[PDB]
Every structure is written in structure tokens, then in C-alpha cells.
């Protein structure tokens, strides 16, 4: 049997209506469109405290190839993450309890060696296709590519990388596609744990002194968490990332269009093609 792993954050769901409404949209579309072969099993990992584990379990029975449901203790994973991810929550979340927002960054060390690949997914997503088709994108990775990720469809990183762009007026950092580097979105993330464990460059980029070195170069202090780490890494070493097609994560947020970037917004937001996964970020309906 071949194993397929999906991870989803599910914290503070207890008495939370918008979060449970999101999870209903997300987990339904995932399940009622998933088609795997008989020999293989889909593993659904959830990181939840005891309070939200009940909420997830009770929800899943209604919407449920064989598929295993694994639950991860938030506190346990946060405790494991903290010593590894401390030096970068002062840069990308500019204290202890907020280590779990950097799980993707250190997923390879948190997860057992038995697992070589995982896909971390938002609950503000809607699935338009079979999720097994996404696992095929792992094969389009170059050797020495560790993360599969779609680019950010808002000019967020124009404002965030402002001081660097003011100093380097010809840089692609913060520029829109296809020529520039708009930064990444963390909604859909293909984490090649096997490659992450084996990459010397990625192993070193997780060290405090390296993080500082690069953040100081870009004058970077962010608030998007793990997304900010990958984005900043993707400027120095864009070859660690297999850039997913926009249709795998079409973000629907249009906030920045109406709060400063009316002109350039479309160059970031544009995505032609049949959408495979929608991302209803900033609480945007689908």
C-alpha cells in the first residue's frame, strides 16, 4: 500500500461558527471529489487541542478507497517546534505559543521518517478536483526543490519588501509575475519532507544566524508567519521552490485592491485557466 498524507490546522474550533462553516466547505469538497485506488489509503492529519478534536471528529462522520484520520496534539507539536523555530518568529511574526504557525517550515523534523511527503492545506479552501491529482505535482519537482507552493496573488510583498525595493529599484523582489517574484501563499503547500531532510541549503537556512543574515539584507519584518519565511527564502534561492500553477490556489482576496494598490493589483491577481482549488482568503466567499 502507498500512503498519501494531508495536514490541516484546526485550532479554536469550539463555539467558532465561521471556522466551522469554512471546514464544512473545505472538507466536503475534498471528500466528495477524492478518488484513490483500492490498494492505497488517504491519511488525514489534524493538529488540534482536545477541545477542537471533538469538533473535527463529529464533523467528519457526516461527510465520510480507505482513509485514515490522525490527530496531532497542538501542545506536543508546539513544544517540539519552539527550540527550532524561535529565532524566526521575531522576524516573520514580529511568543512561545505562536510556534505552531511555523509548522510547515520544520515539518520534516516534526514528522516521522516513515512519511516522505505531506500537503498542508487551509480550511478556507474549496476543492474543484480530485486531491490525488495534486500529488502528481511532486513529480514535477526538480532535484533540490523542497517545497511546492503557489505564488501570492496580492501585492502584499510590495509593502513588506518596501525598504529593499527603495534601495534596489531594478529588483524583481516584490514585482508581479511572470517576470517578477510576487512572493508565496501558504494556503496550499507541497512539503517534500524527504528533500527537506536531505537539503544542506535548507538545513542551514533554518539556523538563527542565517535567518538574521537574510532578514537584515531584505530589511524584513513580517506578520504572515511561515509564508514570510518561504517568501524571503524564495528571493535568495528560488530554486528550492517548485512554483505551483495559480489554478491550484486561486486566492480570492481583493482587499489590497481597495486599500492602496488599485493600479498594480490585477498583475498579481490575474490567473487564467480552470481552477482546481479556490482559496477564500480574508474571509472572501466562493
Q: Which residues are annotated as part of the binding site for UDP-alpha-D-xylose?
A: 9-11, 123, 186, 224, 227
What residues form the annotated binding site for a glycoprotein? 227, 256, 281
CA–CA–CA angle 264, 275, 263 (5° rounding): 10
**Could you give the 3-state DSSP secondary structure of residue 156?**
helix
Q: Which three cell numbers stand for residue 77?
A: 507539536
Binding site listing for Mn(2+) = 122, 124, 279
Cα Rg, the chain, nearest whole Å: 18
Which of 9, 1, 2, 3 shows the shortest CA–CA distance to 189?
Answer: 9
Q: What share of the chain is helix, strand, coil (3-state, %, to 5)?
A: 45, 20, 40
Residue 278, C-alpha cell as written in the block: 479556490
- Closest by CA to 159, choosing from 202, 211, 223, 245, is 223
| One-character DSSP codes across 217-284 | HHT---SSTHHHHHHHHHHH-GGGEEEE-GGGSEE---GGGTTT-TTTHHHHH---S--SEEE--TT-
C-alpha cell at 201: 541549503
Rounded Cα distance, 103 and 81, in Å: 7
Q: What is the DSSP string of 68-83?
A: EEEEE-HHHHHHHHHH
Cell triple for 223: 506578520
Entry field: residues in the chain:
286
Closest of 167, 180, 170 to residue 234, by C-alpha = 180
Tell me the binding residues. 9-11, 122-124, 186, 224, 227, 256, 279, 281
**Dist. CA 248–CA 101, nearest whole Å:** 22
Amino acid at each position: 500500500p502507498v500512503d498519501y498524507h494531508l495536514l490541516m490546522m484546526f485550532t479554536k474550533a469550539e463555539h467558532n461558527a465561521p471556522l466551522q462553516a469554512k471546514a464544512r466547505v473545505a472538507l466536503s469538497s475534498l471528500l466528495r471529489l477524492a478518488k484513490f485506488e483500492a490498494h492505497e489509503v488517504l491519511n488525514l492529519h489534524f493538529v488540534s487541542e482536545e477541545a477542537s478534536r471533538e469538533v473535527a471528529k463529529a464533523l467528519l462522520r457526516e461527510l465520510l478507497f480507505k482513509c485514515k484520520v490522525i490527530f496531532h496534539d497542538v501542545a506536543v507539536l508546539t513544544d517540539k517546534l519552539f527550540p527550532v523555530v524561535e529565532a524566526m518568529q521575531k522576524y516573520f511574526s514580529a511568543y512561545y505559543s505562536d510556534s505552531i504557525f511555523f509548522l510547515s517550515v520544520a515539518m520534516h523534523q516534526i514528522m516521522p521518517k516513515e512519511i516522505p511527503r505531506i500537503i498542508q492545506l487551509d480550511l478556507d479552501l474549496k476543492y474543484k478536483t480530485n486531491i490525488r491529482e495534486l500529488f502528481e505535482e511532486f513529480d514535477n519537482f526538480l532535484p533540490g526543490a523542497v517545497i511546492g507552493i503557489a505564488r501570492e496573488m496580492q501585492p502584499v510583498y510590495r509593502h513588506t519588501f518596501w525598504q529593499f525595493r527603495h534601495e534596489n529599484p531594478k529588483t524583481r523582489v516584490g514585482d508581479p509575475p511572470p517576470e517578477g517574484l510576487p512572493g508565496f501563499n501558504s494556503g496550499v503547500m507541497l512539503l517534500n519532507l524527504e528533500a527537506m531532510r536531505q537539503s544542506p541549503l535548507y538545513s542551514h537556512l533554518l539556523e538563527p544566524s542565517w535567518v538574521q543574515q537574510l532578514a537584515d539584507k531584505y530589511h524584513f519584518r513580517g506578520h504572515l508567519g511561515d509564508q514570510d519565511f518561504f517568501t524571503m527564502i524564495g528571493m535568495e534561492h528560488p530554486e528550492l521552490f517548485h512554483v505551483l500553477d495559480c489554478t491550484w490556489n486561486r486566492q480570492l482576496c481583493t482587499w489590497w485592491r481597495d486599500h492602496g494598490y488599485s493600479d498594480v493589483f490585477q498583475a498579481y491577481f490575474r490567473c487564467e485557466g480552470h481552477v482546481k482549488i479556490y482559496h477564500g482568503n480574508c474571509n472572501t466567499p466562493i
